[PDB]
Symmetry: C2
Subunit: 108 residues, 2 copies
């Protein structure tokens, strides 16, 4: 919360519409036909949603040695599960996947 | 495991020597005066140490829309504990941090 790069431009949840083809799942997934992928995107400037102590250090070191240490990664803090209906050789399977959709975002 | 961009060029553990000044810790941290900061640096190509399903989705979608969707990012999979001696009013504290020194790295 509060982005020094202007609203929306910092690490936050986005929804990107993807078809089975996009994912490379059209051979094994039957339903759903497309997925609203929740995903963490945006910049990670100083003190923005720092995940932990490591993330603060990363911020300070990147500011100081941009050549050696990269900016912190915008990444999921937690995930939502998803139900996939998949194809088997003789029928169908119903499977829950745990770490598929991003729930929450932080920087590291 | 095997980096498709050649030995050592993918997501792995790097060590960056840093001072308390570098870290912005001169006010509150007393010892040690220098930290061998282990962190996670490098590319995350397709199939390289993908942490979960979400990481695989990011790979797929990144090659379609690299403008819009980021590649998986190199982050700590776990940490090594670090002991810091800190100033308090009144005296000092000796404390262990579990979220400070990266132990190993994966792609998320």
């Amino acid at each position: 919360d509060h982005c020094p790069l202007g609203p929306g431009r910092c690490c936050r949840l986005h929804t990107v519409r993807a078809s089975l083809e996009d994912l490379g799942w059209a051979d094994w997934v039957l339903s759903p036909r497309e997925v609203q992928v929740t995903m963490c995107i945006g910049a990670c400037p100083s003190q923005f949603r720092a995940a932990n102590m490591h993330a603060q250090i990363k911020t300070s070191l990147h500011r100081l040695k941009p050549d050696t240490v990269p900016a912190p990664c915008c990444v999921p803090a937690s995930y939502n599960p998803m139900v996939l209906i998949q194809k088997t050789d003789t029928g169908v399977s119903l499977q829950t996947y745990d770490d598929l959709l991003a729930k929450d975002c932080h920087c590291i």
